[PDB]
Amino acid sequence: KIRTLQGRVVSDKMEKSIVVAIERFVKHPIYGKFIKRTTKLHVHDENNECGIGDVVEIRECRPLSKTKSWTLVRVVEKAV
């Protein structure tokens, strides 16, 4: 019921944090073609639960560091 996002984890080398890439399908404003656009977010991953490739559901929260403002909700698909 809370507004959230969904993307795949592209990096988990940092501790308690992951980098999730939110891919979106946007129509080109001029030529009308539907192009892919990637939004990479630094997400807070406590317990280090997410590996590379997991399709995770994230939500926005207060700033947790210089670049982290999103936190993890749950993992949908797990790197396989």
Partner: protein, 122 residues
């Protein structure tokens, strides 16, 4: 071009280069007459065109035409130039007659405002 080729590199609007770059988007520019001389036309035509070289206030040094019949213009004369080329290759500006050093063409009765001639009072 394919829509994808345009997505990757859009259309590049052709940029138009000015024909009077020494004015710098100004209608008129002031300058001092460096050298007053005459020039011969090009091919078909045959005359002795009255022209002058003028260093403008922005540092540009350009050759400017002196329209009308007869002119009293010497070196160090501070005139006002405007756009408008002479078809005399190289000359791309005209001297405003009646502008602070260039007296109007004497004995003008028609198209006086184009040559800075006061209206002859009856």
């Amino acid at each position: 071009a394919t829509v994808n080729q345009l997505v990757r590199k859009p259309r590049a609007r052709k940029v138009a280069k000015s024909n009077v770059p020494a004015l710098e988007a100004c209608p008129q520019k002031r300058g001092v007459c460096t050298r007053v001389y005459t020039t011969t036309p090009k091919k078909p035509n045959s005359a002795l065109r009255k022209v002058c070289r003028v260093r403008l206030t922005n540092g540009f040094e350009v050759t400017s035409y002196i329209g009308g019949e007869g002119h009293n213009l010497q070196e160090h004369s501070v005139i006002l130039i405007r756009g408008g080329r002479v078809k005399l290759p190289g000359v791309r500006y005209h001297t405003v007659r009646g502008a602070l050093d260039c007296s109007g063409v004497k004995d003008r009765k028609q198209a006086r405002s184009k040559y800075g001639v006061k209206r002859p009072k009856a």
